[PDB]
Amino acid sequence: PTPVKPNYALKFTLAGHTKAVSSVKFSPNGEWLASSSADKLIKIWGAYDGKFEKTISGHKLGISDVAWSSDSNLLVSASDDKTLKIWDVSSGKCLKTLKGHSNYVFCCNFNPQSNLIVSGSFDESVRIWDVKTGKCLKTLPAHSDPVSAVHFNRDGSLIVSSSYDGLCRIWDTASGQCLKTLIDDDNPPVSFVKFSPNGKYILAATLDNTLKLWDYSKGKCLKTYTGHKNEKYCIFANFSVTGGKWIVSGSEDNLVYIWNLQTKEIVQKLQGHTDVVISTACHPTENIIASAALENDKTIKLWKSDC
Amino acid sequence: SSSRRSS
């Protein structure tokens, strides 16, 4: 049963957004895909049949990122309007507007407990917010250039952030202190970071066509994934764990790349988008990928593999 | 419209 390669095949193309898509994310309960776009809208789609479910509106400018709560009932979105918004998915209503960043909000996530939201912004700060009250609990002077990604680890006790300043930092959620600064070589911009599913590693993209897997604690690079194009955009990357253990990323050559996590060999390339694939997401229980593309494409594609 | 990520 150990796989050798996936066989992702296109099942659905989801059109509706009227500007570039920025981020796609599967709900933790597997039922839904949420997408955000430069068109200022969130759209919710059925994860299994591509069925359009609803549009969620209210931001005054484009959205760069969206993230789900652990129970699949809330979304948080990060917008160029300098705010985040917390949304009730069932109703589509804005429950809270998280005000405090002084420039575009670029990235966001809930902690696993989903009592906190973390955000990163072009204002070069990382902010930690109380879900219940909408209060900003902490502002971290995390970076000296825009923050490209923020992510909680599996127990919520750590946050990893990345920035165009070239750093990846690991923060103690409770205290706000930097536990560790991952710095490497001439330090190109770090355009994306997230924790591995088990919390021991950090997957980081740099704007030199490189993904790297790092043991944060040991400060050592374990794996490097190359062969794609990423020199401009903050492209999401994923750990695929439902079948074969893959790394997934979009690319500026309009393809989805899939690598063997262990061997670093490319195991599949998905063709079909007609612009930069800015975002990919991996379904939490099924071998399903979502991909989304920029202005000349504006579609979301759903792909299925047997492994 | 625009988003910083899609620009």
A94: burial class by Cβ within 10 Å (0-12, 13-18, 19+)?
middle
Sheet holding A210-215, edge to edge: A190-195, A201-206, A210-215, A220-225
| Structure-determination technique | X-ray
Residue A151 and residue A211: Cα distance in Å, rounded?
16
Residue A137 and residue A135: Cα distance in Å, rounded?
6
Residue A231 and residue A241: Cα distance in Å, rounded?
27
CA-nearest of A238, A283, A232 to A256 is: A238
Resolution in angstroms for this experimental structure? Answer: 1.9
Residue A184, C-beta contacts closer than 8 angstroms, at least 6 positions apart: A212, A221
Euclidean distance between the first and the last CA atom of chain A, given in angstroms as a whole number: 9
Instruction: Out of A62, A104, A122, name the one closest to residue B1 (CB).
Output: A62
Q: Under an 8 A CB cutoff, do B6 and A21 touch?
A: yes
Residue A120 and residue A71: Cα distance in Å, rounded?
23
Residue A146 and residue A121: Cα distance in Å, rounded?
6
Cross-strand pairs, A68: A75
**Angle at the Cα of A34 (from A29 to A37), degrees rounded to 5?**
165
Chain A contacts in chain B segment 1-7 (CB below 8 A): 1-7
| Domain A19-289 top-level CATH class | mainly beta
Q: For residue A41, give how far its alpha carbon lies from the nearest alpha carbon of chain B (Å).
A: 11
| Contact present, A11 and A304 (Cβ < 8 Å) | yes
Instruction: Out of A22, A122, A146, name the one closest to residue B6 (CB).
Output: A22
The one-letter amino acid at A108: C
Sheet holding A42-46, edge to edge: A21-26, A32-37, A42-46, A52-56
Tokens of A221: 């690079």
